[PDB]
Amino acid sequence: MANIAVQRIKREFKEVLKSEETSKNQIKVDLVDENFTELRGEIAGPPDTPYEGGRYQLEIKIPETYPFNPPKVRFITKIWHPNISSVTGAICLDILKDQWAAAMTLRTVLLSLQALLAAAEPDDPQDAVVANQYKQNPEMFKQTARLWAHVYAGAPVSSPEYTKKIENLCAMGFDRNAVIVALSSKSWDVETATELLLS
């Protein structure tokens, strides 16, 4: 890469390694290749959110044009959130689009992502179904999010009512993730979820 991009990355990488945040075990970034084109980030779910206790892996791609363009970031670890795709991990956050500023860093992006988990913006949604549930049924959203955090991100807490609906469907021979997706999408309505699974 261009010298400007290389120096920025190394420098940013050492900002994270030495930050208060890694020591507190909340943000983290690792190398994938030796070119610095791809990085793997990790963020801890923020406290007092349904994501609490969870750890989320992030795919980070540095463009040839860094730092005048933002890094491309996607969630590897599945998450139930209005601004992130429950299927692809795609993010809707302004700094990753037209609000990138050259002064921003890897640390600031990670911290910003953590902040988004704590504060969703459902009127600028990435995943419409999730955003609706968020607005229509907040407790349902909390629980669903906590369930995904548990299933995918290792978050500790569990919901017994949702777990047994998951097994009842998996009993029919349905793929488990498919089941979780269906139940979450359909507001835990077994009949409606089932119809989706059959379709």
Binding site: A171, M172, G173, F174, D175, E191, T194, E195, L197, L198
Partner: protein
Amino acid sequence: MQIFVKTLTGKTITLEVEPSDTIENVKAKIQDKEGIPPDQQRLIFAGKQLEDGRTLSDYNIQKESTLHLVLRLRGG
């Protein structure tokens, strides 16, 4: 053959069947012991909706197998 079908509120029922039996005909056994028209029945096994005209043998349905019945939910 002995097999079970579980319905919506969970009731578990039993049928005596032949491996050779078609799906149409299992549904008939269903209509009688239970009353549901075959036109309204969907039979599920191993994550797949069972088409009428294949057989239990065709779906590898063996003795003590449970099948799931989910009714066709009106709509229009």
